[PDB]
Design a protein around this nucleic acid. Sequence first.
RNA 1: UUGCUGGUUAUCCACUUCUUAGAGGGACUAUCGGUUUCAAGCCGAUGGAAGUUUGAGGCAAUAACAGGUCUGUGAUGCCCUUAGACGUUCUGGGCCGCACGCGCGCUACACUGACGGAGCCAGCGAGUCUAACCUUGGCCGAGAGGUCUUGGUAAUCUUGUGAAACUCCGUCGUGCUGGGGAUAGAGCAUUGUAAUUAUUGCUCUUCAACGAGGAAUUCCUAGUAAGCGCAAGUCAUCAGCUUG
Lengths: 206, 70, 60, 63, 143, 68, 145, 141, 139, 80
Amino acid sequence: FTPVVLATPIPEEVQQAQTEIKLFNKWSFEEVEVKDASLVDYVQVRQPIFVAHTAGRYANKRFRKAQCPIIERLTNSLMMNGRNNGKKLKAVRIIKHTLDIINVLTDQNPIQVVVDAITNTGPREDTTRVGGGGAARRQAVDVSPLRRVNQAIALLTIGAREAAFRNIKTIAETLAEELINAAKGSSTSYAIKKKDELERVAKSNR
Amino acid sequence: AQHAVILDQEKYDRILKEVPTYRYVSVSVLVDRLKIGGSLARIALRHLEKEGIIKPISKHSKQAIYTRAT
Amino acid sequence: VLKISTRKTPNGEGSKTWETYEMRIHKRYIDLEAPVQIVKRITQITIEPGVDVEVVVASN
Amino acid sequence: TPVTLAKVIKVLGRTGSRGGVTQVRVEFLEDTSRTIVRNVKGPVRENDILVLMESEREARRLR
Amino acid sequence: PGVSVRDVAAQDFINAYASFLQRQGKLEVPGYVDIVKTSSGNEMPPQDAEGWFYKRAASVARHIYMRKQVGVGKLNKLYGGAKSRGVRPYKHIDASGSINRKVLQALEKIGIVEISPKGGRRISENGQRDLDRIAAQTLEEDE
Amino acid sequence: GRVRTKTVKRASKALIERYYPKLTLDFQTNKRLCDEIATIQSKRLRNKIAGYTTHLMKRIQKGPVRGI
Amino acid sequence: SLVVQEQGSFQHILRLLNTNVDGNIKIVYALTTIKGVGRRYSNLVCKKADVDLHKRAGELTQEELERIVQIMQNPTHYKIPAWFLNRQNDITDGKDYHTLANNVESKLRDDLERLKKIRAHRGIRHFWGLRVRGQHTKTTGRRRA
Amino acid sequence: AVPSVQTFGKKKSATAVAHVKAGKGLIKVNGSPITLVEPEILRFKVYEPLLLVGLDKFSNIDIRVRVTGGGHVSQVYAIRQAIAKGLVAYHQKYVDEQSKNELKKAFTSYDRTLLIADSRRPEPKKFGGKGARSRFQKSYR
Amino acid sequence: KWQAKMAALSVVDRIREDSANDLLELTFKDAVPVLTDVATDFKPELAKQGYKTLLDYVSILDNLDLSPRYKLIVDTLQDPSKVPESVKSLSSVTFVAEVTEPSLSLLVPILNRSLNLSSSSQEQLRQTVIVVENLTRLV
Amino acid sequence: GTIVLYAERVQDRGLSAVAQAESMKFKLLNGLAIRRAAYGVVRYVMESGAKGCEVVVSGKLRAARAKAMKFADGFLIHSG
RNA sequence: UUGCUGGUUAUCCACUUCUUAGAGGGACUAUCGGUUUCAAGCCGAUGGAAGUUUGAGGCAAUAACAGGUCUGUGAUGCCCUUAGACGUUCUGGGCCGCACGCGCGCUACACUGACGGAGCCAGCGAGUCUAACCUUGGCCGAGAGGUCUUGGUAAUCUUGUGAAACUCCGUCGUGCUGGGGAUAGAGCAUUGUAAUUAUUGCUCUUCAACGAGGAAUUCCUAGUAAGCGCAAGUCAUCAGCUUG
């Protein structure tokens, strides 16, 4: 593809990818596209990135959070339960291995699996605790799509956290089976369970 | 201690016969088949890449990833 | 910057409010090559209330 | 399972006691010119597309 | 080309030079190897007991290659990690000084490191020679 | 909130009331006129008074402003 | 590393120093169920006895176990220096012992009576069952009785 | 004297000074090539100048970056800012204005603060809490 | 440099080809450890040629007692992972011939390795001490 | 011989807080009534071309309970 | 084959980008659009190092509280005592005493981990004149520490404080387990006139509850919460505290 040799030799795989197409850890960003209407403009494939780390100021405005690339936003939600606050390099390792496991099981480009897991796990209807006379009757409401992406990322990663806790599976594998089983949503995953519980409670209280 | 550790004779044939057909294979999967502790799963993961059976796609310790050979 | 942090209160009652006093101290140094008369002239002169001058010789 | 899409055309304000619900006017994507008023749960703005799981219940105010 | 030890990744070089020091044999290991803890902020002896002194010796030879000089105490500050003080919070604790000083004397005995002026210990000519030579060999191995 | 106090507004008003030529519509030149013809004891207050004079120039030049 | 064939010489729970040891765990940490030997002592003993540490404790041919017992209860003879021992400079011999399994509690009880007969404050405090090392006892230690 | 510039890049307390001169195409960090930048996840974070813009334009120039301050992560953002700003300063002073515009346009079209320093600095903490915003836990009897 | 050391190894093989063995046994005694240091060089080509030079150079030694042993012995002089293996095989040799300078000079680096190593077992330390005692009382 | 004391009459000696405060204190120790003494201080400071003066006297004054009286004139700032 | 990586408080020359600190500049919500009693303003984009009052503070009104402090004061009224003292000093103890209840915290319940090598990166500080402070370097010791010198009244030396979490390679493999390190025993050192009611540090041994915490309840909106250590205050020694 015409590699260039310069005095500090950059390896041919680094030039191979990174000069022409600005693909991921190594996975493409032309294809995958979102398979749901809106949840476009709130899942931010293309802009592509090279690593899922960025010191990005997405917090100081009301909707700049949607410009975070969806892999980095899922990466950011991994570093919690207290002891793991901070530690984003661990989180990039977990995402990197999760994407590679997802390429092994169901060959199928892993950013498609991740984006389809976001579209298939965000609750389309939820519930709010209105007063209604003290013993607060709960009323059903619709949801905004940024809230759907928010809740989908929290449901996925909290399912992986609860699943990887105290068993021989690492967290890249529980993220892998959670993202796979939520992708073509199999309702054995934690996230599809929680999503349909939220929708059946809001269906009961509409 | 829950029938998961040592080296036993039938498990060598069970590793050489059933680690093929495994799409994704790692430490945790060689544990998770009601079988080996993680220590001999790591030993057998290095041994099944020594010849034949598995391709490593991803290297780094605390997450082994291996795939079926072709 | 010399900082001294102390409680505001002489007793221990009240919400714990703290107070960071500080004294700034600025230094300079000028290397000259002067004859000993002109040394004496510039060393006695430039007295100021609140400036400290220290003059040394022999740059070895 | 009847899904529906609807574009937010005019956000009307905030309702609910604690204030997290949004009064939204939505115009349907498929078979348009029919606008309704829904209560959404999260952060919404105009030119979104809501997913309406049941399409005919026009909400007005929450306490 | 011309290869310094700076042109090699650190763990690759330290494995190559530590395996070389292992194999070749000019050792002077202290004898209290495999009884010693390498720190007071540690819990166990080093898990690579047949070895690990060549590991520390190789890392110290790379560490004096990259600086003007280091004494014993900077190696004790470097190789000492955090100590779990029981139920009290953790703290930085320096490593074992006899380990690092006998590393420095064991390297000084084989001509790698010489006691410099301005204190400390320096890399010498027959240290730079050998370290750049095996750095070129380590980069050669991956051809 | 960028509401400007009565110091900025009354000094800006008084600067336009006696210097309407000299006081164009550009901030960077009114910034120098408030340095020349007024004595303002700070740089930040100078920039604020100069910005409000430029603002009142911008709305004088499309018809009158009540007061000035 | 490498897989080994290993016919049925492996044994589960094995009796030494008058107690049981789980054969299904690695030797250095399987010997610590014996009282009086911990992680460091067992590590050094299993080094001095020329034992491969990558062995499970059930593998362990009886020459290795006999060496382990012999070094464990004669430790100054096998150059475990003096300071690696929990009964140095005793109070009757002035030699250094290493109290092993069903002896170590005995020596602790012996130690206690040697205070308690002498009526020193640490002994009187041990016999009341209160805190001994000068801890505050107002707020802590409330379910130990 | 070769046509050479010097630039710098910063993050929270990390600074990295680059010397960019004419040469054969070596990129060095502290003496060591840029393929040795480890934490090793953020390696492709520091490659991003060298291939947002083509791996040529580094063919004829030599970059040496020296880093100081910060930690293992903020230093990588410092040195990628150093490489990027140094390349656009070398193109400003010696090549021409238009090619400098094309590099700056490519970097700004990506912009992980590649040209502009990250303006965030740590907040001073206050009394009554372990942080800047946080407080100590109170009891209300 | 390694090419100059390859040249020196080639001319050492030239001298070992040329001169007679009984004259060469003094230089055997002198030249075992330096060829050990060359066969333990990190550069693998220099290591292979320093191994081959040592192999031929011990193969000129006229000893029927250590004649099948040689291939292992320089192998033990190559890597000290074989020093636990080498003493147990060095015990099983019927030492009927007098052990002068080269027959002992080919042996005693192996014994020094089994002495100084921390990797060596107390069985191997005992065997090596027994060997050096009977080898001092064998001459 | 290495330390030289120099007197100096201070100038515009009403515009110092220390001079007026120890003046007020002596006039009170001698036994002036409190309002009179404080108004003498405040008027002598405003005569000296001040911009303002505050004289605050706390304590018990012929009653058992402590009070305070703020005798002021002119304009004083408080913050900055 | 030009080359690459280093060393040399002066072998010289030049420079001030990085560092320092004097004097200045810079942002005023500038420009544009929307909206608005087309006022004050508000909302979005562009440009910008900076567009929440740019971020954080310091100062902070009137009137009060029977708020707290007579144990900060040679601030202080009135009462009490003043030689068998309520003054002052010395010796020993106590403020640590333990069926229990409450508040601030530290360490944990593990594999997003523990341990073992290896990588290796800060910022605010503070430091010895009638003295023994911060301590590099060399030897001794498993360690804590010891000993001989050296540098520094400090942008100079300690100190690039080579800090910790973290990163890589491994051992462990889900087991109150190698998570956890309480409790208790023996030994070696340091500070001190004096260490027992264990000052503290180190080594070996002992190996407790704790499997994510009920009712309740705290703090928090961006370099912020949280994790992580470092310096200073106190200090002969001792930080699980506070200030940064």
